[PDB]
Amino acid sequence: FEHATTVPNVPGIPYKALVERAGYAPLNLEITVVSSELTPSTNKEYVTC
Amino acid sequence: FEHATTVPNVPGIPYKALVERAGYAPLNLEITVVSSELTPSTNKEYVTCKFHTVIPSPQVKCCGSLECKASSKADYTCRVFGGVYPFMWGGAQCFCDSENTQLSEAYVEFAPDCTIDHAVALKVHTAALKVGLRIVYGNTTAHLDTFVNGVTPGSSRDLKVIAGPISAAFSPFDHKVVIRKGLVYNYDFPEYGAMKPGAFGDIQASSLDATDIVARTDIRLLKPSVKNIHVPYTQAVSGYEMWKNNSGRPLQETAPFGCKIEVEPLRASNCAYGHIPISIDIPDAAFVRSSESPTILEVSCTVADCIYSADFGGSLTLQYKADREGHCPVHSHSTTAVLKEATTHVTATGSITLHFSTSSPQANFIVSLCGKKTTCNAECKPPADHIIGEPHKVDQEFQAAVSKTSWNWLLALFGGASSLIVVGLIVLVCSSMLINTR
Amino acid sequence: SPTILEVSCTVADCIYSADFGGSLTLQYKADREGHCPVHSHSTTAVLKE
Ligand SMILES: *[C@@H]1O[C@H](CO)[C@@H](O)[C@H](O)[C@H]1NC(C)=O
């Protein structure tokens, strides 16, 4: 079942929802962002000291 | 007690009814069509296969005449040639220089492999339906094999079941049928003797071992123009092979109503079409008096998560406070929703769950529990899955198939139009009375 | 899935904060014993369980 929702980007804070397919029982679904990783592409120019 | 009802002809899909007999308690009764056989009466017209077209050894008579008589062989073609001079391995075969005579003969016969690779032509008359019925009443099962003509009783002797005529006679077979190796085709074959070369039915016989074989394969015996002894013959192709190359698809793949065709008596099996009126003379011993059935003092139906679907998508709970522990028949009194369970157990108090399948968007049917009737009310959601592997247990109505919200909207708009009409006519009535008074 | 014949929520000592502050009790009657998804259908209040 394709279910689309929106979660916050806060680490922790479980986001809870029900997926409710018609013929079947409501099903719990929570998504938690355990960690996040902004990794930019870095190009090395030089080293100084 | 006699009970007359109408069941669908679909295989499976139990039809459930509640026989109510005065003071003899409600009796559950479900009928399942476990099998169906549409068996027409078939008359064998002929058999056919490839022909062998055997050419006998030529006869030569030199300085003489060699006219030939008629023969009873299948498509016997004989022709006399008067200018021959045959040559075997060893030179000339007779003395006479130019007045020789060769007899060319050519007749067809059944191929050696026609014991399997052959086709049978049948004329098919009207077909009679025979259904296997699993009928359970009370706590007793019964398996019957009933003709659906309308007068023949069932196979079982303890209960009498009479299945009335089908609403619409189907008969998937046309008047002419060809069976080839278990495959059934609706082909318009020629009659016995009204045959044409090249088409299906070049060679015909009553049986494969029959000596009365008739054929009209177009054999032309040409004149021998070579040194060696030869019978130059030309012929049309086998109509069996031509028909086999373009036979199309058999009726095992093109039959309507999901029929499933066999060949040994040539019956169509499990054809879901029409309705069977059925009357059952239930024995009096099956019924029990209403004193021995538990009485439901009060019942309440609460139904949640209803889905109108082919499967049993709805579930309703009956809360009850009866007076004695015992078994009740549970029934749904609508033609749109059907209960899965037909008999439940009843404690002094409690609740029982029941699965039902419906086609209406609204679950506004009446459920009976030892004859005590309650009304359920909910809104049944459309199913999410689109395709299911089992057929629908119920048919689709018009009043049921329109939801209560949509019924409210259409009735509100129609009543608004009618109300403006009524107000207009009332204002004309009042104005006309005022102006004729004045 | 079990079906709920009757449900009613009474909530005591609610307090709007980051912590799960507030206790709502569902009094329920259901025919079959089992396990059940529970959910809050508001984007403002989220359940712990
Ligand atoms: C059929 O037999 C069962 C056996 O469990 C019994 O409970 C039930 O009452 C019987 N039905 C009738 C109609 O007597």
Automatic annotation (TrEMBL), chain A:
Subcellular location: Host cell membrane; Host cytoplasm; Host nucleus; Virion membrane
Domain of life: Viruses
Subunit-level organization: The precursor of protein E3/E2 and E1 form a heterodimer shortly after synthesis.
Name used for this protein in its record: Structural polyprotein
Organism: Western equine encephalitis virus (WEEV)
From TrEMBL, chain B:
Transmembrane residue ranges: 409-435
Coiled-coil parts of chain: none
Cell location: Host cell membrane; Host cytoplasm; Host nucleus; Virion membrane
Subunit record text: The precursor of protein E3/E2 and E1 form a heterodimer shortly after synthesis.
Protein name, entry field: Structural polyprotein
Residues shown, of full length: 798 to 1235 of 1236
UniProtKB/TrEMBL annotation, chain C:
Organism domain of life: Viruses
Locations listed in the record: Host cell membrane; Host cytoplasm; Host nucleus; Virion membrane
Subunit structure: The precursor of protein E3/E2 and E1 form a heterodimer shortly after synthesis.
Name this polypeptide is given: Structural polyprotein
Included stretch of the parent chain: 1090 to 1138 of 1236
